[PDB]
RNA sequence: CGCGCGCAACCA
RNA sequence: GAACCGACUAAUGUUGAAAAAUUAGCGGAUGACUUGUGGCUGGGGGUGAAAGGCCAAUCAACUAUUUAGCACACGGCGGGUGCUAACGUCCGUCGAAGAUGAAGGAACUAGGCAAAAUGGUGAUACCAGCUGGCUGCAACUGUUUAUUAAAAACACAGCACUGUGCAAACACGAAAGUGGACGUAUACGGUGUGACGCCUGCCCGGUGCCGGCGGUAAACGGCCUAAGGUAGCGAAAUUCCUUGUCGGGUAAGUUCCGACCUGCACGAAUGGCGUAAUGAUGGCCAGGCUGUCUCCACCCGAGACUCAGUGAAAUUGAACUCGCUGUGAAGAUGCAGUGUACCCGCGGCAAGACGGAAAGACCCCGUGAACCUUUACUAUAGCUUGACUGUCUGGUGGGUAGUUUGACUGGGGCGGUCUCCUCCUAAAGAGUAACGGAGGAACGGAUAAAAGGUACUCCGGGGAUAACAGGCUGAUACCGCCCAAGAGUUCAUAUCGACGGCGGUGUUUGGCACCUCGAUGUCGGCUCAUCACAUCCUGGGGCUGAAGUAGGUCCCAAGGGUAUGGCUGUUCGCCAUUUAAAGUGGUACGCGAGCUGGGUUUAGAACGUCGUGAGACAGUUCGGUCCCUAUCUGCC
């Protein structure tokens, strides 16, 4: 699981790979 | 497509309407060296999106 | 006592074009905070 | 997007 | 024909919103029904 | 890639 | 073209000679001129050829909490989130690398800014048009933001709609009354448009308005629907993509001109398209001219400098006021380590003293403030309706007023959320957070009753909280290296090298919010640089898929060197022509108490667009004040 690039810290957990 | 075949150049967006955009290297360009063809994108304000967009554009051009 | 343009062959700033009170001056002499000093043996006016 | 903010207590 | 007596006539839309009901806008805006400078409907409205 | 192909995508 | 009136450019001046001037130029100069004296108009008021202009240097007059300003911080261990990143955030618990050690003649520049030149009559001094070509916009002369905006903005003649029958409509007036107008529909008011020429298409469903369900768009508007954009025009003041494509122009042209039409998002009186003349109007090209520049040199005066007289000012915790590297509330004269340095002037320069000048204007915050806004709410003047000018009464009523417009939020906005239930997070009692992971059924209720805009803004605060730079971090980025499937005729490793792996750098885009909101000025250009080496050239090597020539690649090497132009504000890039090469980076993306101000980032204005509107737009377009006499360090 990774957060998308240039995205701030909050607003839920990222997406899986 | 092979990623080494082309290169990616980043630079500053024209018409820099503020202290942030004055500095940031959000504007992008891909040169596909053997074909010689060029594409660029400064539509977005994040560099990452821009790069992707211009890559797509490049691909389209190649096609 | 020679100025930078005579002594060190410094390029004069624009003789016109808005340039104010700054025609034959040495321009900048250093950087910013980092060195925070003028380096020794800087090319300046005198003799 | 976040759609998980809910929780009860006991 | 300013000799005749009549001074210049500033259009409401040219004015600021504080001056005339038509006044105000960035560029040329007029999303108002045409009224006198005292807010009375100008086209059609009888007396 | 947000919200409904459309809209939004901002302030320095 | 003088006086006079103005105020487009310029340099100076910016503790001035001046609380907006100076010299040089510049516009109008028989008029919509200018001026003297006196009078009138008064503050939500005037006045305004309209800029929110001007009205005496003054002018938009744990829990609960509409609650988050009981902010915690780090280290350990158990976690969530993040990248098993962060001096991050939210809970529980006590191999091998880095940055201080004359001739030329626009080649200038954003731009020929400034100069130079032209100059008279039919010219020796002073005096005294630069000219021409293409084009946008506005017809024109005028007016405008006194003091950063003179314009494409306003006005304008003209055109149209509409009201108005005279005790006129309308306006100022609690009223009388006055203006309109001593006028009377060929007149007057309001609204839009804006000379002139050719014109001005369709839609009445919506919101108005008019008539009594109809009508009306030169009403506000729009072009399966109310109708689907007509003529004209079209990458345009509008075209994002885009520096569109082609042509012209040029050695080279992001600009310009002509076409094309793919009109993101032209379009017909919030006029469309032409348009002679006019413009301190915008863009482009040419001739002339020139120190604009190549690249400055000399001279003449005024300061600067020395003496004599007088004699300020901002600033200032105290100073016995060095460099570096580190450290540190995270960029050090003061701390550690270290190097260097006799004491003291003067003339200079301006890199630092997050220098001085303004309790930041940007951002957020405040149950601040103002104005403006509208179909936000509540009123209300006025207008209108009736019942008995008055009282009551319905309607209408941003004309005017008082207000309103939530919080959470890895700054705010936008999106999402707000109450209750179940699970996990939760670390074997209970509890236990996050815009954590999964699911289900403004919820301690500010009022009975409430949207917005502000770049015209304002105040109080905040580095509690953003944009710049620093810091931590290194996902991304860049630079290596490992493995070797293959490509390379054959042959992995001359050159490449997939699928994967491991680093380094701080170097892009980021994350964080630690530094500063009692101001740390922002891109680019210029002037000055300085350091790194991951070296572009020159130097020395190895290997070569190295005959030579010429290369490719790798190692060593930072001593020196490392382009002028066209286009664009640009960095970048493209092109032209060079060059031995036209290095890549750090240095507050070096350098504004050194310069510029073209871009951006106020107030004017316009277009496209969105909004009913005020206004707004990481859309565009024209215009738009850059202060500081140096105490200390530093340096000459
Ligand atoms: Mg400086
Ligand atoms: Mg106006
Ligand atoms: Mg009003
Ligand atoms: Mg205004
Ligand atoms: Mg005044
Ligand atoms: Mg509290
Ligand atoms: Mg707390
Ligand atoms: Mg912390
Ligand atoms: Mg040049
Ligand atoms: Mg240019
Ligand atoms: Mg000139
Ligand atoms: Mg002259
Ligand atoms: Mg044009
Ligand atoms: Mg004036
Ligand atoms: Mg002014
Ligand atoms: Mg002016
Ligand atoms: Mg019409
Ligand atoms: Mg054209
Ligand atoms: Mg119309
Ligand atoms: Mg004129
Ligand atoms: Mg000469
Ligand atoms: Mg703090
Ligand atoms: Mg130091
Ligand atoms: Mg230090
Ligand atoms: Mg200061
Ligand atoms: Mg403050
Ligand atoms: Mg809030
Ligand atoms: Mg438990
Ligand atoms: Mg902070
Ligand atoms: Mg914190
Ligand atoms: Mg700066
Ligand atoms: Mg080396
Ligand atoms: Mg500017
Ligand atoms: Mg404006």
PDB file of C-alpha atoms (C1' of nucleotides) in Angstrom, chain G residues 3-6 28-29 31-36 49 142-144:
ATOM      1  C1'   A G   3       1.101  83.641 -22.360  1.00  0.00           C
ATOM      2  C1'   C G   4      -2.261  80.682 -20.016  1.00  0.00           C
ATOM      3  C1'   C G   5      -4.124  75.669 -18.971  1.00  0.00           C
ATOM      4  C1'   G G   6      -2.540  70.979 -18.483  1.00  0.00           C
ATOM      5  C1'   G G  28      -4.511  71.690 -25.485  1.00  0.00           C
ATOM      6  C1'   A G  29      -4.049  76.687 -26.419  1.00  0.00           C
ATOM      7  C1'   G G  31     -13.028  76.844 -26.512  1.00  0.00           C
ATOM      8  C1'   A G  32     -17.076  70.922 -23.926  1.00  0.00           C
ATOM      9  C1'   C G  33     -11.296  77.007 -22.955  1.00  0.00           C
ATOM     10  C1'   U G  34      -9.200  79.465 -18.904  1.00  0.00           C
ATOM     11  C1'   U G  35      -9.283  82.687 -14.887  1.00  0.00           C
ATOM     12  C1'   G G  36     -10.610  86.668 -10.732  1.00  0.00           C
ATOM     13  C1'   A G  49     -17.632  63.958 -19.023  1.00  0.00           C
ATOM     14  C1'   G G 142     -12.594  66.665 -25.127  1.00  0.00           C
ATOM     15  C1'   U G 143     -12.813  64.088 -19.383  1.00  0.00           C
ATOM     16  C1'   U G 144     -10.637  60.877 -15.693  1.00  0.00           C
TER      17        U G 144
END
